[PDB]
Amino acid sequence: PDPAAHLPFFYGSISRAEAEEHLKLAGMADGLFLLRQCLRSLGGYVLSLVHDVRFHHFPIERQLNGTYAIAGGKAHCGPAELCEFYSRDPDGLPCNLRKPCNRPSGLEPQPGVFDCLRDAMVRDYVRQTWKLEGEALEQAIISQAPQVEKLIATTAHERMPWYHSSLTREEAERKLYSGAQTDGKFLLRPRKEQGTYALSLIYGKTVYHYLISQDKAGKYCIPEGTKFDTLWQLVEYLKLKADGLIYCLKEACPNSDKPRPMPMDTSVYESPYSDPEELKDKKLFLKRDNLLIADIELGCGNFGSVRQGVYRMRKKQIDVAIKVLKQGTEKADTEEMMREAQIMHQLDNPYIVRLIGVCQAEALMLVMEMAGGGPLHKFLVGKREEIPVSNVAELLHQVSMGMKYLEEKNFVHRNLAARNVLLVNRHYAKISDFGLSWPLKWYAPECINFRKFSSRSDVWSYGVTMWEALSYGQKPYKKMKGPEVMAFIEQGKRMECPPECPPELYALMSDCWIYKWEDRPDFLTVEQRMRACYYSLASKVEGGSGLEVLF
Ligand SMILES: Nc1ncnc2c1ncn2[C@@H]1O[C@H](COP(=O)(O)OP(=O)(O)NP(=O)(O)O)[C@@H](O)[C@H]1O
Ligand SMILES: [Mg+2]
């Protein structure tokens, strides 16, 4: 995720002529400006502007600690910031930024090599760290991209299999001719000159050596000149672009609680039935003998009582959460519940609480995954200082991804609220209580008005859920109740934009509250939109208390 991908004046990987072109068409007015990618430095941009009808191009280097600055200028926490600052203070520039050269309608930034490099490295960090695949992997990427990128830049080259901490030119030469003499086979070693390294590669059965040089900035360099923040990136980039090399890198000559928790560090990120064998025998109805129901309760709600337990599986014992439906069948509606549970037993997403199965004994029991973190709204109460706006944006994201999935499968969650989003940890939220057939504050009108439950109705309560989240647990439509809102709503009257909730996110939960359920968007759009916002927030520096902040 590029931090400057939301800014409508950012054009991605384009040349100078292209930039200068767009700038013509827009007037040439003094203070007109755009931002684009820098082709020869990883993470950098180029600030281009028009002063006295002449173009000015300012390279913006991405420093090591994450800050961005024009050479010899002030450092910023990011592009957005950088461009707001120079809008009200030229500070060295010819004039102050004035009119963004907003991108024309329908265009989006043009993907560059670094983008592919970034998205690719990400995909492989996860793939290898958590041996994840299928949507499982697609889903851990979408939500955790931002965090991975940060882990990537902190991953020491010493750790990599292609780095050899104490080889000399000849030793290097020696080793390489020792194994398979394929083209592209390579290693990297530390030079005498501190902060210098060598890239030894095999081509046409000959070892070639390239010097890697570091900056006063601390960046890393191919004598070709392209600049990277770490060796791993450099190396990973040279398997793609052969610039300045006899040949590109291929195979690697081989070598010999956490601060910030991730969603896939958990046991519940992936379905219990993903062990092929465990999957083979996936009964909707569970035996009561393989169930251990604790006497003490996790909580209690309108629907029933929730008790922690543990379930015996073919090869493992899993922590489960049991909900005891307060209400049983009455009439052979029993199956109809069965019919449903059958549909829920299918839904598989890392961001929803999964149905392990059901079990009937003393009571009808809903056996589900263990998200013992307690619900969203409570978790956020009075934690405005402790839990940054980005970390909330991240949990709202995960919820969107769950509803996205649920939408996909033509499944309506009807009881969507903060109270129905349960944290596994501070960065991992799961949606729950989806098929359970004042709590009418979340319901879009047409549910109340016509009992019409669509995913478009869910889209409403999401906007409601967003409000609760972005205002740290505060009740919604406090000052009201029942028809009080029904009327309050009928008249284009909406909830307020909680303090310090960005414009985009409000404008979002707002579109969620468009009376005509048709004119309202679908989750596909929401998660899409929710993503950009989240991403721009996360790519920055991190707020809050704890120990994950020291990292
Ligand atoms: N799978 C679970 N894992 C751990 N705790 C849970 C789980 N499901 C529910 N709980 C607990 O029970 C509380 C919520 O009660 P629940 O029975 O889910 O109904 P509710 O959110 O209060 N209202 P409603 O779903 O609208 O009837 C939460 O605060 C949780 O602590
Ligand atoms: Mg609940």
Does residue 398 have its Cβ closer than 6 Å to ligand 1? Answer: no
First vs last C-alpha separation in the chain: 20
- The number of the ligand nearest the C-alpha atom of 302 reads 1
3-state SS string for 383-407: CCCCCCHHHHHHHHHHHHHHHHHHH
From the number of C-beta atoms within 10 Å of its C-beta (0-12, 13-18, 19+), residue 448 rates as: middle
Largest alpha-carbon pair distance within the chain? 84
- The distance from CA 50 to its chain's CA centroid, rounded to whole angstroms, is 36
349 Cβ partners below 8 Å, 6+ apart?
Answer: 139, 401, 402, 405, 406
- Distance of alpha carbon 96 from alpha carbon 77, whole angstroms: 19
CB 142 within 8 A of CB 264: no
- The distance from CA 466 to its chain's CA centroid, rounded to whole angstroms, is 17
Does residue 435 have its Cβ closer than 6 Å to ligand 1? Answer: no
User: Which runs of E-coded beta strand occur in 392-469?
Assistant: 421-425, 428-431
- The distance from CA 364 to its chain's CA centroid, rounded to whole angstroms, is 37
42 alpha carbon – ligand 2 mean position (Å):
45
What are the structure tokens assigned to 242, written together?
């052969």
Looking up tokens 């931090």, which residue turns up?
3
* Nearest to 167, CA basis, from 195, 185, 192: 192
| Strand partners for 12 | 110
Q: What is the dihedral of CA 28, 31, 36, 40, to 10 degrees?
A: 100
CB 320 within 8 A of CB 309: yes
CB 45 within 8 A of CB 63: no
Q: Which CATH class is domain 283-372?
A: alpha beta
CB 228 within 8 A of CB 220: yes
CA angle 266/271/277 to nearest 5° reads 120
What are the structure tokens assigned to 25, written together?
């068409």
- Distance of alpha carbon 324 from alpha carbon 321, whole angstroms: 10
CB 380 within 8 A of CB 473: yes
Q: What is the DSSP string of 244-295?
A: TSSS---SB------SS--GGGSSSSS-GGGSHHHHHT--SBPPGGGEEEEE
Q: Does domain 9-112 have CATH number 3.30.505.10?
A: yes
- The distance from CA 93 to its chain's CA centroid, rounded to whole angstroms, is 35
Does residue 345 have its Cβ closer than 6 Å to ligand 1? Answer: no
> What was the experiment behind these coordinates?
X-ray
- Distance of alpha carbon 300 from alpha carbon 161, whole angstroms: 51
- The distance from CA 196 to its chain's CA centroid, rounded to whole angstroms, is 35
- Distance of alpha carbon 139 from alpha carbon 57, whole angstroms: 39
Q: Which CATH class is domain 154-257?
A: alpha beta
CB 46 within 8 A of CB 37: yes
DSSP state of 221: E
- Distance of alpha carbon 365 from alpha carbon 311, whole angstroms: 13
Does residue 299 have its Cβ closer than 6 Å to ligand 1? Answer: yes
What are the structure tokens assigned to 527, written together?
């998660």
299 alpha carbon – ligand 1 mean position (Å):
6
What are the structure tokens assigned to 100, written together?
């963004």
What are the structure tokens assigned to 501, written together?
């909730």
What are the structure tokens assigned to 44, written together?
């950098």
- Distance of alpha carbon 175 from alpha carbon 115, whole angstroms: 34
| Strand partners for 217 | none
- Distance of alpha carbon 50 from alpha carbon 31, whole angstroms: 6
| Strand partners for 186 | 201, 252
Q: What is the DSSP string of 310-327?
A: EEE-SS-EEEEEEEEES-
Pairing of strands 317-325, 355-360: unpaired
Does residue 306 have its Cβ closer than 6 Å to ligand 1? Answer: yes
What are the structure tokens assigned to 156, written together?
């020491």
What are the structure tokens assigned to 177, written together?
């001719």
Atom of ligand 1 nearest to the CA of 372: 4
3-state SS string for 86-106: HHHCCCCCCCCCCEECCCCCC
Q: What is the DSSP string of 339-393?
A: HHHHHHTT---TTB--EEEEEESSSEEEEEE--TT-BHHHHHTT-TTTS-HHHHH
Does residue 433 have its Cβ closer than 6 Å to ligand 1? Answer: yes
Q: What is the dihedral of CA 168, 173, 177, 183, to 10 degrees?
A: 120
CB 324 within 8 A of CB 303: no
84 Cβ partners below 8 Å, 6+ apart?
Answer: none
420 alpha carbon – ligand 2 mean position (Å):
4
Atom of ligand 1 nearest to the CA of 371: 3
Q: Which CATH class is domain 113-153?
A: mainly alpha
Q: Is the dihedral of CA 408, 414, 417, 423 positive or negative?
A: negative
- Distance of alpha carbon 31 from alpha carbon 51, whole angstroms: 7
Residue 431: CB atoms within 10 Å = 28
- Distance of alpha carbon 539 from alpha carbon 73, whole angstroms: 22
* Nearest to 438, CA basis, from 376, 482, 487, 380: 482
- Distance of alpha carbon 202 from alpha carbon 216, whole angstroms: 30
- Distance of alpha carbon 197 from alpha carbon 463, whole angstroms: 52
What are the structure tokens assigned to 484, written together?
């009080």
> What is the enclosing helix (H) or strand (E) of 138?
helix 135-154
Q: Going edge to edge, which strands form the sheet with 206-214?
A: 186-190, 197-203, 206-214, 220-221, 227-228
Q: Is the dihedral of CA 71, 77, 78, 80 positive or negative?
A: negative
- Distance of alpha carbon 341 from alpha carbon 162, whole angstroms: 50
Q: List phi, psi (to 5°) of 417.
A: -150, 170
Domains 9-112 and 154-257 agree in fold: yes
Q: Which of 306, 352, 475 to mutate to test the pocket of ligand 1 (most atoms within 8 A of CB)?
A: 306
- Distance of alpha carbon 160 from alpha carbon 469, whole angstroms: 40
CB 12 within 8 A of CB 79: no
Q: Which of 305, 322, 433, 436 to mutate to test the pocket of ligand 1 (most atoms within 8 A of CB)?
A: 433
Domain coordinates in residue numbering, the chain: 9-112, 113-153, 154-257, 283-372, 373-539
244 Cβ partners below 8 Å, 6+ apart?
Answer: 210, 222, 223, 224, 225
Atom of ligand 1 nearest to the CA of 300: 15
Q: At what angle do helices 389-408 and 455-470 cross, to 10 degrees?
A: 170
What are the structure tokens assigned to 323, written together?
């909900």
CATH number attached to the domain at 373-539:
1.10.510.10
